[PDB]
Amino acid sequence: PVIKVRENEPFDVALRRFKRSCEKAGVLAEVRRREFYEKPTTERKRAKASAVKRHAKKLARENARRTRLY
Amino acid sequence: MRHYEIVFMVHPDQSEQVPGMIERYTAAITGAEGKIHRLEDWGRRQLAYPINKLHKAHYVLMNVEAPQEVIDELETTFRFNDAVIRSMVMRTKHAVTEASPMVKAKDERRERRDDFANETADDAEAGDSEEEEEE
Amino acid sequence: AKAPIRARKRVRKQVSDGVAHIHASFNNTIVTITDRQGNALGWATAGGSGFRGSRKSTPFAAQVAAERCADAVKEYGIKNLEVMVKGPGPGRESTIRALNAAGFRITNITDVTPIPHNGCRPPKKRRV
Amino acid sequence: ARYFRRRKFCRFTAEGVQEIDYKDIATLKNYITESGKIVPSRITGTRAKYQRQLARAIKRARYLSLLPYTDRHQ
RNA sequence: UAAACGAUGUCGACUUGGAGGUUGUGCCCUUGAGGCGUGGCUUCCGGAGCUAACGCGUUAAGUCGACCGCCUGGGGAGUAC
């Protein structure tokens, strides 16, 4: 996961962020552990869970003003 | 009928076996009041990673519509053809059998980007121009 | 300074150019120089730098491995390099900087890290 | 003026590209990097249907060597 | 068989909704995975009401309806019989 995508102008330090778009994730991340078939369905699927923090954050900006912290 | 998009590829040196089998298969399709809505040969193309040896194979895209019965004798036959390395047959839902996305790239391949060699004369004897031995 | 020497004549494989392969684990690093069509011109390791243990798998141990191997292959007669990378292990950049310090250009830092189609079940490790 | 129905850039900001066809390589590459793998749906904000039929299609295609299956073949 | 479930039986009637994910589909620079029109699962949010408390709230843990399953201190016993 130095990533095959070539960094603009070649250098000895890979620009690993700017190279990667969806690599290592799922594919080379679960190293040396017993592989389950169906566990992801209940283990991993936390999209619903992260959607709550994004709403909450968009609510609180108006509310800090209404408290006059802002 | 239900629409079955069969595409398959063939090993060059064993290819001489398939030109007799495809023309019995197209006849089993139109013999049942299904249709061949194109029958496109693409010529020989490079595999990225080898399948059943050799880094090249020869491609035929059928664009079938056919009844379910007929497709049951055919799938078992193309899968157990030695000349064929692999085949894939695609779903009825939202399925095209006309206006090929790869029609230009097929012509380009056939006309100009082919091998142009004797082992691939064996492939042009397996496309739309099929010739096969007498039994 | 310059000396008045007889003609030089020896061969090993006189390659001028190569590929390298770096198989990076959690416990060690394997760095191996090859011919372009792909045949061994030498290797080194971070355990063959004689650090032992976990210490074989740090940037500073990846570095000196890369340098171990790069010295010897001058007798095989290599002058320019490309690298193939295979692993999640440590020494990501610091092994490349050392290949560059052997006087070679390293424009191609090519990942080939093989992802099987969900291969053999790995060791369970801990009982939780 | 009324009833345009899909001129351009209308319904959705990102287009659905193909569904279930797998014989063209460039229609597939709209969701496959040069590194050789399919993109998560979270990242594009694609809608789920066009992604589900494509998963199937990209594999049909992979098994016929119309694409590289694995990163070691770059 | 169990952690057979939002630890919550079934099916059905009734009780302010907004918005997301995403789909049938009327209408729209389909300019907004959006809006409005109307269904769909799925998910955030909270009112009337209910709770020991968390928590639920139109996918109830609300108002109810009929009929079923099942419980009545712990250990020893999910075994004995």
UniProtKB/Swiss-Prot annotation, chain A:
Region: Disordered, residue numbers: 42-70
User: Which stretches are tagged as biased composition: Basic and acidic residues?
Assistant: 59-70
Q: Name one Pfam family in it.
A: Ribosomal_S21
GO CC, alphabetical: cytoplasm; cytosol; cytosolic small ribosomal subunit
Q: Biological process (GO) annotations?
A: cytoplasmic translation; ribosomal small subunit assembly
| Taxonomic superkingdom | Bacteria
Q: Annotated Gene Ontology MF terms?
A: rRNA binding; structural constituent of ribosome
Mark out the compositionally biased spans (Basic residues): 45-58
Q: Which family does it belong to?
A: Belongs to the bacterial ribosomal protein bS21 family.
| Record-linked HAMAP family | Ribosomal_bS21
UniProt function note: Probbly involved in recognition of ribosome rescue factor SmrB in stalled/collided disomes; fusion of protein fragments to its N-terminus decreases ribosome rescue in the presence of SmrB.
**Quaternary structure annotation from Swiss-Prot or TrEMBL:** Part of the 30S ribosomal subunit. In stalled ribosomes contacts ribosome rescue factor SmrB.
Q: What is this protein called?
A: Small ribosomal subunit protein bS21
User: Which organism does this sequence originate in?
Assistant: Escherichia coli (strain K12)
UniProtKB/Swiss-Prot annotation, chain B:
The cross-references to PROSITE patterns, in alphabetical order and at most eight, read: RIBOSOMAL_S6 (PS01048)
| UniProt modification remark | 5 different forms of the protein, varying only in the number of C-terminal glutamate residues, were isolated. The sequence shown is form bS6-6, which is the longest. The first two Glu are encoded by the rpsF gene, the other Glu are added post-translationally by the RimK enzyme.
Q: Which residues carry this modification: N6-acetyllysine?
A: K93
Which Pfam families does the UniProt record give? Answer: Ribosomal_S6
Per the similarity annotation, which family is this?
A: Belongs to the bacterial ribosomal protein bS6 family.
Q: Could you tell me what this protein is called? A: Small ribosomal subunit protein bS6
Record note on quaternary structure:
Part of the 30S ribosomal subunit. Interacts weakly with uL2 in one of the 3.5 A resolved structures.
- Composition bias (Basic and acidic residues) maps to 104-116
PANTHER family listed in its UniProt record? MITOCHONDRIAL 28S RIBOSOMAL PROTEIN S6, SMALL RIBOSOMAL SUBUNIT PROTEIN BS6M
In its keyword annotation, does this UniProt entry include RNA-binding?
A: yes
UniProt keyword annotations, A-Z: Acetylation, Ribonucleoprotein, Ribosomal protein, RNA-binding, rRNA-binding
Instruction: Please give the GO cellular component terms listed in this UniProt entry.
Output: cytoplasm; cytosol; cytosolic small ribosomal subunit
Q: What does this protein do, in the record's words?
A: Binds together with bS18 to 16S ribosomal RNA.
Which residues lie within the region annotated Disordered?
Answer: 98-135
The GO biological-process annotations, alphabetized, read as: cytoplasmic translation
Write down the Gene3D superfamilies for this protein, in alphabetical order.
3.30.70.60
Curated annotation (Swiss-Prot), chain C:
Q: Which residues carry this modification: N-methylalanine?
A: A1
Can you name a GO cellular component term? cytosolic small ribosomal subunit
Q: Name one GO biological process term.
A: translation
**Single GO MF descriptor:** small ribosomal subunit rRNA binding
**PROSITE patterns per UniProt:** RIBOSOMAL_S11
Keyword field: Methylation, Ribonucleoprotein, Ribosomal protein, RNA-binding, rRNA-binding
- RNA-binding as a keyword of this entry, yes or no, is yes
Q: How does it assemble?
A: Part of the 30S ribosomal subunit. Interacts with proteins uS7 and bS18. Cross-links to IF-3. In stalled ribosomes contacts ribosome rescue factor SmrB.
Q: What is this protein's function?
A: Located on the platform of the 30S subunit, it bridges several disparate RNA helices of the 16S rRNA. Forms part of the Shine-Dalgarno cleft in the 70S ribosome.
Q: Which HAMAP family match?
A: Ribosomal_uS11
Protein name, as recorded: Small ribosomal subunit protein uS11
Q: What is the lineage of its organism?
A: Bacteria, Pseudomonadati, Pseudomonadota, Gammaproteobacteria, Enterobacterales
UniProtKB/Swiss-Prot annotation, chain D:
Please give the organism: Escherichia coli (strain K12)
Q: Does the keyword Cell wall biogenesis/degradation apply?
A: no
Report if keyword RNA-binding is assigned. yes
Q: Name one GO biological process term.
A: translation
A molecular-function term among this protein's GO annotations: small ribosomal subunit rRNA binding
Any one GO CC term of this protein is:
cytosol
Q: Protein name, please?
A: Small ribosomal subunit protein bS18
The record ties this protein, via InterPro entries, to: Ribosomal_bS18, Ribosomal_bS18_CS, Ribosomal_bS18_sf
Q: Which residues carry this modification: N-acetylalanine?
A: A1
Q: How does it assemble?
A: Part of the 30S ribosomal subunit. Forms a tight heterodimer with protein bS6.
- A Pfam match is Ribosomal_S18
**Keywords on record:** Acetylation, Ribonucleoprotein, Ribosomal protein, RNA-binding, rRNA-binding
Which family does the entry's similarity section mention? Belongs to the bacterial ribosomal protein bS18 family.
What does this chain do?
Answer: Binds as a heterodimer with protein bS6 to the central domain of the 16S rRNA, where it helps stabilize the platform of the 30S subunit.
